[PDB]
């Protein structure tokens, strides 16, 4: 995995294991994803091709 969004640029040598959604917009997300409610993590793809 890796991350696409975070509150701010992490400091050097810090571990972030947070899960809360990142509010790109002023819209409240209330713990549930939606439009402008971006889940931070994203998986990769590792095919032999």
């Amino acid at each position, epitope marked *: *995995l890796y991350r*696409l969004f975070r509150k701010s640029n992490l400091k050097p040598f810090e571990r972030d294991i947070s899960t809360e959604i990142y509010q790109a917009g002023s819209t409240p997300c209330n713990g*549930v*994803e*939606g439009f*402008n409610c*971006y*889940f931070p993590l*994203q*998986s990769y793809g590792f095919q032999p091709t």
Partner: nanobody
Framework: QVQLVESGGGLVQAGGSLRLSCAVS??????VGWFRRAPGKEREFVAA????????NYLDSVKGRFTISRDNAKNTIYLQMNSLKPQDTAVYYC????????????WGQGTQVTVSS
């Protein structure tokens, strides 16, 4: 491009368990989500699962009796309803993300599931 098709939507009696399973073409690079349209409301989040992932998010209302799964073999995702409370009837849509900017990249045609009390 990748395409998703929804099947398995139909009326169920109160308390029934119907497993909503939508097929996906070329799954694996994407995370798929389940949203439903209330009769007078717009889509809201219910379930989503990342490939081979244990990352699970659910709405508090649908919490406690829903689970989502990804088979990894037939490229189809499975959502199980368990004893739906009648007001929870809605049309569920499969959607996927490549790089989410506004919402999920693709929207499925969806299906209708309804419950009689």
């Amino acid at each position: 491009q990748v395409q998703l098709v929804e099947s398995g939507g139909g009326l169920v009696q109160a308390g029934g368990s119907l497993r909503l399973s939508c097929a996906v073409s070329g799954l694996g690079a994407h995370r798929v989500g389940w949203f439903r349209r209330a009769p007078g409301k717009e889509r809201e989040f219910v379930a989503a699962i990342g490939a081979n992932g244990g990352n699970t998010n659910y709405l508090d209302s649908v919490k406690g009796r829903f689970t989502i799964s990804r088979d990894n073999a037939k490229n189809t995702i499975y959502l199980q309803m368990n004893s739906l409370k009648p007001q929870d009837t809605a049309v569920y849509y499969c959607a996927a993300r490549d790089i989410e900017t506004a919402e999920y990249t693709y929207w499925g045609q969806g299906t209708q599931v309804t419950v009689s009390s």
